[PDB]
Amino acid sequence: MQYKLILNGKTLKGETTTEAVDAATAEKVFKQYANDNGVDGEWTYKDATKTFTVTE
8 A cells, every 4th residue: 555654854854655565565665765864753644545654
């Protein structure tokens, strides 16, 4: 499924997607994508719109 990630912060902001087979994999990959770009923050997940949010 296409999961989404929303980024709120100053180091990084905007939206990005990933095709992952479930929400555990999608979570390892988005958190990898955040560490790549310097992002440290708090995470929510919303199984109803398959969407992750991280806010710095």
